[PDB]
Scaffold this active site. Structure first.
Site, PDB file in Angstrom:
ATOM      1  N   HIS A   1      -3.625   1.472   3.342  1.00 47.88           N
ATOM      2  CA  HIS A   1      -2.553   0.333   4.180  1.00 47.88           C
ATOM      3  C   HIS A   1      -1.946   1.096   5.178  1.00 47.88           C
ATOM      4  CE1 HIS A   1       0.315   1.370   1.078  1.00 47.88           C
ATOM      5  NE2 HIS A   1       1.013   1.033   2.280  1.00 47.88           N
TER       6      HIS A   1
ATOM      7  N   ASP B   1      -7.341   1.961  -2.322  1.00 46.52           N
ATOM      8  CA  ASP B   1      -6.169   1.724  -1.928  1.00 46.52           C
ATOM      9  C   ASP B   1      -6.127   3.716  -1.265  1.00 46.52           C
ATOM     10  OD1 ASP B   1      -4.303   2.071   0.573  1.00 46.52           O
ATOM     11  OD2 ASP B   1      -2.336   1.005  -0.890  1.00 46.52           O
TER      12      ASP B   1
ATOM     13  N   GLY C   1       7.996   4.062   3.198  1.00 45.13           N
ATOM     14  CA  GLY C   1       7.627   5.339   3.458  1.00 45.13           C
ATOM     15  C   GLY C   1       7.337   6.145   3.050  1.00 45.13           C
TER      16      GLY C   1
ATOM     17  N   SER D   1       4.501   5.496   0.521  1.00 44.82           N
ATOM     18  CA  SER D   1       2.518   4.874   0.143  1.00 44.82           C
ATOM     19  C   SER D   1       2.305   6.197   1.615  1.00 44.82           C
ATOM     20  CB  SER D   1       2.843   3.832   1.355  1.00 44.82           C
ATOM     21  OG  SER D   1       3.331   2.945   0.439  1.00 44.82           O
ATOM     22  N   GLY D   2       0.896   6.186   0.147  1.00 47.36           N
ATOM     23  CA  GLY D   2       0.059   8.135   1.472  1.00 47.36           C
ATOM     24  C   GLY D   2       0.148   8.911   0.695  1.00 47.36           C
TER      25      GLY D   2
END
Ligand SMILES: [Ca+2]
Length: 240
Positions: free
Chosen positions: A45, A93, A186, A188-189
């Site tokens: 995402h 994801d 912020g 995420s990932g």
């Protein structure tokens, strides 16, 4: 990261800042985990937008020069083929980024170690989420890397009605949900680092939080379970 504390500079050396170009500048948008000298693992995402991305390794303070950063363009983006942007609850994801150059390893830049395939953490396992994401729901990004202790919440507990229900899959790891500490926009990932047999491994890729807010009781932060994607990862890297 809501309710975190500033990380020591050399604690999480595989953590990266994924940034996109906005005019003359670069804006931080997500975390990532350095897994090869030229490969980064992040959330699918984070890279749905047709933006120009770069990765910064060795980063500690987004807003000051640390004397330790390396900046590298993103050369190829391989999102999980089953990923569906309007369905984060479906999972998948995850994405891999091949960097335009191989980064140099040192005390600030190391590869993140991944769990062995299929490994599932016992309930309440010790983990830390790291990132530069919002420090409060609807707040602002952290300047310095934050960390927060977030114990896993197992699948049985996590998918139960009072928690996430059918929204959480077994392809995910849940952690936290204390209503105080959480991932936030912020983050995420980025990694969820969990201690196993004395060594930290990146068990999760930060995926989502409740639409109600970041730190919400019984809405623990949700991560892509890295241990379900080990073949996929090796498969991608092997063919690129
Ligand atoms: Ca910096």
């Amino acid at each position: 990261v809501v309710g975190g504390t500033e990380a020591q500079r050399n604690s999480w050396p595989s953590q990266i800042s994924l940034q996109y170009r906005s005019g003359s500048s670069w804006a931080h948008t997500c975390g990532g985990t350095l897994i090869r000298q030229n490969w980064v693992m992040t959330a699918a995402h984070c890279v749905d937008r047709e933006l120009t991305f770069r990765v910064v390794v060795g980063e500690h303070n987004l807003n000051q020069n640390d004397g330790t950063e390396q900046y590298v363009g993103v050369q190829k983006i391989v999102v999980h083929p089953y990923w569906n942007t309007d369905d984060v609850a479906a999972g998948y994801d995850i994405a891999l980024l091949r960097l335009a150059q191989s980064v140099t390893l040192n005390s600030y830049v190391q590869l993140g170690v991944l769990p062995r395939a299929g490994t599932i953490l016992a309930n309440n396992s010790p983990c830390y989420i790291t990132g530069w994401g919002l420090t409060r729901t609807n707040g602002q990004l952290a300047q310095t890397l934050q960390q927060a202790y977030l114990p896993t919440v197992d699948y049985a507990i996590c998918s139960s009605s009072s928690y996430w229900g059918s929204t959480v899959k077994n392809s995910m790891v849940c952690a936290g949900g204390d209503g105080v500490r959480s991932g936030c926009q912020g983050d995420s990932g980025g990694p969820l680092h969990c201690l196993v047999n004395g060594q930290y491994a990146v068990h999760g890729v930060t995926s989502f939080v409740s639409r109600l807010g970041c730190n919400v009781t019984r809405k623990p932060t949700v991560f892509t379970r890295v241990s379900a994607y080990i073949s996929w990862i090796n498969n991608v890297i092997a063919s690129n």
